[PDB]
Amino acid sequence: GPLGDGAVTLQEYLELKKALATSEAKVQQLMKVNSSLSDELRKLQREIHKLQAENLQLRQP
Amino acid sequence: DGAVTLQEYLELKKALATSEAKVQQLMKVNSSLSDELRKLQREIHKLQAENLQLRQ
């Protein structure tokens, strides 16, 4: 980047690099949480399979 | 050189905008995943309650 009197100051450059790093970190965190949530989704779906099977047996006269 | 610095800065701004769009898309899908997990949990609980009623 520039040295600490042009169109882009060193402070502007550093602030932009930090904003990009912050946004990239947030993408990584979103991907980690979405992976965890996607695994949880499958577990909860399986719990419905379990209870649906029980429900159908209980209803059978 | 100031022209080179300007171009580097503008490319970084474009990268930031692209990253922000990706964050917004992943937030959208996070929210949908979260809504669907809450819905499944409510459906599990309704089946659990109905099954216990069928036993009474």
From Swiss-Prot, chain A:
Tissues where the protein occurs: Widely expressed. Expressed at high levels in testis (at protein level). Expressed in the brain, including in CA1 hippocampal neurons, in the amygdala, and thalamic nuclei (at protein level).
Coiled-coil portions: 27-61
Signal peptide region: none
Region ranges (Interaction with MAPK1): 5-53
Modification(s) after translation: Phosphorylated on tyrosine residues by PTK2/FAK1 and SRC in growing fibroblasts. It is required for the interaction with NCK2 and for GIT1 recruitment to synapses in hippocampal neurons.
Domain notes: The coiled coil region mediates dimerization.
Role noted for this protein: GTPase-activating protein for ADP ribosylation factor family members, including ARF1. Multidomain scaffold protein that interacts with numerous proteins and therefore participates in many cellular functions, including receptor internalization, focal adhesion remodeling, and signaling by both G protein-coupled receptors and tyrosine kinase receptors. Through PAK1 activation, positively regulates microtubule nucleation during interphase. Plays a role in the regulation of cytokinesis; for this function, may act in a pathway also involving ENTR1 and PTPN13.
Assembly description: Forms homodimers and possibly oligomers. May form heterooligomers with GIT2. Interacts with G protein-coupled receptor kinases, including GRK2, GRK3, GRK5 and GRK6. Interacts with PPFIA1, PPFIA2 and PPFIA4. Interacts with GRIP1 and forms a ternary complex with PPFIA1 and GRIP1. Directly interacts with ARHGEF7/beta-PIX, forming in vitro a heptameric complex made of a GIT1 dimer and an ARHGEF7 trimer. Directly interacts with PXN/paxillin; this interaction is enhanced in the presence of ARHGEF7. Directly interacts (via C-terminus) with TGFB1I1/Hic-5 (via LD motif 3).
Protein name according to UniProt: ARF GTPase-activating protein GIT1
UniProt organism field: Rattus norvegicus
